[PDB]
Amino acid sequence: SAFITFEGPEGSGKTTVINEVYHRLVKDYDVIMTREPGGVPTGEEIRKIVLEGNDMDIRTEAMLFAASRREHLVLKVIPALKEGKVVLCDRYIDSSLAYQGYARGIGVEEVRALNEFAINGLYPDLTIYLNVSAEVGRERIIKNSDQEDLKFHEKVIEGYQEIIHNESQRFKSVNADQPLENVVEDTYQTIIKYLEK
Amino acid sequence: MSAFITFEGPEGSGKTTVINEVYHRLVKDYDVIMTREPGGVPTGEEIRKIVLEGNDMDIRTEAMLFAASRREHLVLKVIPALKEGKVVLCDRYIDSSLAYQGYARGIGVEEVRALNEFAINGLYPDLTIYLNVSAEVGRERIIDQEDLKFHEKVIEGYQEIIHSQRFKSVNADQPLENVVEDTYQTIIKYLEK
């Protein structure tokens, strides 16, 4: 079994990439993919509260997300990891550090603390990072379609930039400035390289 | 009247904390900025970005790219600020590459020195703070065998380096609060004199 997570900002191609990588791997591996909280009712119901949040406090927001993450972990991720499966997750801990910790201003380590509580020391065996630059990212978001969104997005990236330093044991970065056909392949090779050895 | 101040140390030495506390104490009275290579510089970014997406990339290539991204950072951000007469607080510099790449990764200190002497073109810190942390104190502030022995190699490589015109060592084995304060005193004593 293997717990492999994907992480990336707006415009990193994260959705499409993961879906496409996933259907390739299924050919050859006992592998599933899940979108946190992955239809788990308590996780989904918890999260409903943040989405329905009316200018809600970010720490309230981060705690509910961590709780929602945990429900999904314990009711879906762990049971499938226990039946030998490979498990792919659209987001996980490192997302929270980048959005809540660095971008929103709570504190990387405070949010890491929160998250260590929620996940009981279940770190991913491998994390894929979709390294997209602020400029290409911006261009993806515009392409598929104020000054707030932009600098905030530039901040998200910045935080992903810090997190990933000194965590190379589990991180591998793919180029997400490449056409999506190439982001897929490099990601798929990263994952299978990991599984083979 | 302008100061190029660098901060060296291994991970676990408090560096991150110390540089920020001290930034915040010095903004009151000095035209200070806070930077870490590649510090937002585009060319600098681009170069670094290639090493990241490296798959088992040669270590010397990696080191050259590290120097190029450094010299972009230095010439496009550090040098212009020194000229407007700023205090630039810099997180990692020449001595970082030596310990990590010269000593810890086995390339050779003199070979990394010579390459870093090319990238900075004789532009050294006016003052370099070394947060001197033991390995065992380092280890604990951090949390496998590879990383513990790599960490120890980094520290060992610094100990070789530091052996004093620009170097001052804060004892990083103190609580972080005291490492911050001694670092400050050490810096204000440089700027006020």
From Swiss-Prot, chain A:
Transmembrane segments: none annotated. It is an enzyme of class 2 (transferase). The keyword ATP-binding applies. Pfam families: Thymidylate_kin (PF02223). One of its GO terms (molecular function) is dTMP kinase activity. Phosphorylation of dTMP to form dTDP in both de novo and salvage pathways of dTTP synthesis. HAMAP family: Thymidylate_kinase (MF_00165). This is Thymidylate kinase. The gene is tmk.
From Swiss-Prot, chain B:
It comes from the Bacteria. Disulfide bonds: none annotated. GO terms for cellular component: cytosol. The keyword Nucleotide-binding applies. Pfam families: Thymidylate_kin. InterPro entries: P-loop_NTPase, Thymidylate_kin-like_dom, Thymidylate_kin_CS, Thymidylate_kinase. One of its GO terms (biological process) is dTTP biosynthetic process. Its EC number is 2.7.4.9. ATP binds at residues 9-16. It catalyses: dTMP + ATP = dTDP + ADP. PROSITE patterns: THYMIDYLATE_KINASE (PS01331). GO terms for molecular function: ATP binding; dTMP kinase activity. Keywords: ATP-binding, Kinase, Nucleotide biosynthesis, Nucleotide-binding, Transferase. It is an enzyme of class 2 (transferase). Phosphorylation of dTMP to form dTDP in both de novo and salvage pathways of dTTP synthesis. NCBIfam families: DTMP_kinase. PANTHER family: THYMIDYLATE KINASE (PTHR10344), UMP-CMP KINASE 2, MITOCHONDRIAL (PTHR10344:SF4). Belongs to the thymidylate kinase family. This is Thymidylate kinase.
